[PDB]
């Protein structure tokens, strides 16, 4: 299964952010990261831990070992608001993390 922390993530434009997940068995780098922009279906960002699926800008990167995996956004831009979800594919059935809502800190 999966645990995602933190739940909310206030961040300023330009800032970096990190969202992590932890599994119950070692999942061998088979985890993926989804962005569900508000009012839309989720979309893929990274699969196999760190492999960026095409179209995703390189400000997103993934990493992780054993049971902990992290998504990092180096320079947060406006379009990156919404809820992120990790998901493992180490063993069926595929299980998703509870989600981390990224909100843009503004004036």
């Amino acid at each position: 299964l999966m645990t995602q922390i933190p739940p909310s993530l206030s961040a300023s434009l330009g800032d970096k952010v990190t969202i992590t997940c932890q599994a119950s068995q070692n999942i061998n780098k088979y985890i993926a990261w989804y962005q569900q922009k508000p009012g839309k279906v989720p979309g893929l960002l990274i699969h196999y831990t760190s492999t960026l699926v095409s179209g995703i800008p390189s400000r997103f990167s993934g990493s992780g070992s054993g049971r902990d995996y992290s998504f990092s956004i180096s320079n947060v831009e406006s379009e990156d608001i919404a809820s992120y979800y990790c998901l493992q594919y180490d063993s069926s059935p595929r299980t998703f993390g509870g989600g981390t809502k990224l909100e843009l800190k503004r004036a």
Partner: protein, 109 residues
């Protein structure tokens, strides 16, 4: 499609029309998102061999299936509970679901 309002215990068959791709090169999987935004895995079918798997949550009530010929994925929900209320997606599955469903809201009340 196939969604809508249904009274607890009712049944419903969700569809999912795929295009662009070679249908049988990829597994389709049913994932839902509840009103409180939580995502859940509903089921997994391998369309070429017929094989279906599920969490306990819907075990014995939902039945995933497909038609490699007509390019259709199906979800047949039976004995619906209030907790099945949610948006239902499918998604073409190689190592992930990289596309592709726009949703379809089922509401059990």
């Amino acid at each position: 499609s196939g969604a809508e309002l249904a009274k607890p215990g009712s049944s419903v068959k969700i569809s999912c029309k795929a295009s662009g791709y070679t249908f049988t090169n990829y597994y389709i999987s049913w994932i839902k998102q509840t009103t409180g935004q939580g995502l859940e895995y509903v089921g997994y079918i391998s369309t070429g061999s017929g094989g279906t798997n599920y969490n306990e949550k819907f075990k014995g009530k939902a039945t995933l299936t497909v038609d490699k010929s007509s390019s259709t994925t199906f979800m047949q929900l039976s004995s619906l509970t209030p907790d099945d209320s949610a948006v239902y997606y499918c998604a073409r599955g190689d190592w992930n679901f990289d596309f592709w469903g726009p949703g379809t809201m089922v509401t059990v009340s």
